[PDB]
């Protein structure tokens, strides 16, 4: 019915894959609340055979729950009710930090997933706006920055702030992690997880995330122990600014030997009766089963490995062993920390 007189934020989760998108989305939630505009829930993005698939927020997560954090609308609602009445085509401007080259601009629809995401909701942009000139950019907790935002893009002139990418830092700040208390798997996904667990995973079970597709080597080449800077999600196991210790290649990219040894250790730590493995490539089922044979238990995977059901299963594990650098693992860690009545235990490869 009524539309928000403070205006709206819509954005493309245009950086990285699902872990990346969620990580920034928590920040966008914090941003929308502080600014006090209603957030249009994004379509998440999945890169497949030839196509870029936009996934409705509500296919993955419950709107009811996220609405307990801040004012939200589904993309379906935005497209049907809000856009036709508050955001006519002549007012559709894109927002980004600073102009860049392909005439310099936001280039909000150049390439993949940029073009397809906006095509999905029949948005073409008629002009660009920049916010990078505001001191502290999208950090609304810098004194004066919020006032400056409301001065530069008032809701009367700009009913919809439409961002080329998430208006949030990457990696996420520690202060926003607990916001994923407000992300709850759709019933569909939770039921797929529950069925796999009851059929295949005698309790208590250890769930492990094996991050090992071809893009990972380069990720872990980033590690230099002398400077010990945060790398993607590493602060999830080493604390903000790595106050707990040193990021190592053993943490980022454990060897097969190290993986098997630590699975065995974690099985023994809980008297586990089964192991679940989620992986982007090599689930190591044969190697793990061989390593677990003296202990008369097995490892199990989904066939095929659906990334969302996999995250949900790892969230329900008695013990989760994740990859500390991975933002995909970070989703599980944050669910285990914040989703429930009380926190459920997590561990990571290479960290004591
Ligand atoms: N099916 C499945 N896919 C995965 C798994 N781990 C990674 N992936 C894929 O690889 C992407 C990794 O990107 P991202 O989620 O941002 O996490 P990060 O790169 O590990 O920080 C995921 O979003 C998935 O598309 C897994 O355990 N199962």
Residue numbers in the entry: 24 to 125, 132 to 381
From the primary publication:
To determine the structure of CePOFUT1 we obtained three different crystal forms. The fourth one is a crystal-form-III in complex with GDP, resembling a product complex. A comparison among the different crystal forms revealed minor conformational changes within the two domains (RMSD of 0.25 Å among apo crystal-form-I and soaked with GDP-fucose, and 0.66–0.86 Å among crystal-form-I compared to crystal-form-II and III, respectively) and some differences in order/disorder loop changes, such as a loop in the N-terminal domain (residues 125–134). The larger RMSD could have resulted from differences in crystal packing and not from bound ligands due to the small RMSD among crystals-form-I with and without the ligand. CePOFUT1 is a monomeric protein, as determined by gel filtration chromatography and confirmed by analytical ultracentrifugation (data not shown). Unlike Asp242 or Asp244, Arg240 played an important key role in binding and catalysis.
POFUT1 α-fucosylates serines or threonines present in EGF repeats containing the appropriate consensus sequence, C2-X(4-5)-[S/T]-C3, where C2 and C3 are the second and third conserved cysteines. In the present study we have solved the first crystal structure of CePOFUT1, which serves as a conserved family member. The protein shows a typical GT-B fold formed by two Rossmann domains. A cavity for GDP-fucose is localised in the interface between the domains and a contiguous solvent exposed pocket for EGF repeats was identified by electrostatic and docking studies.
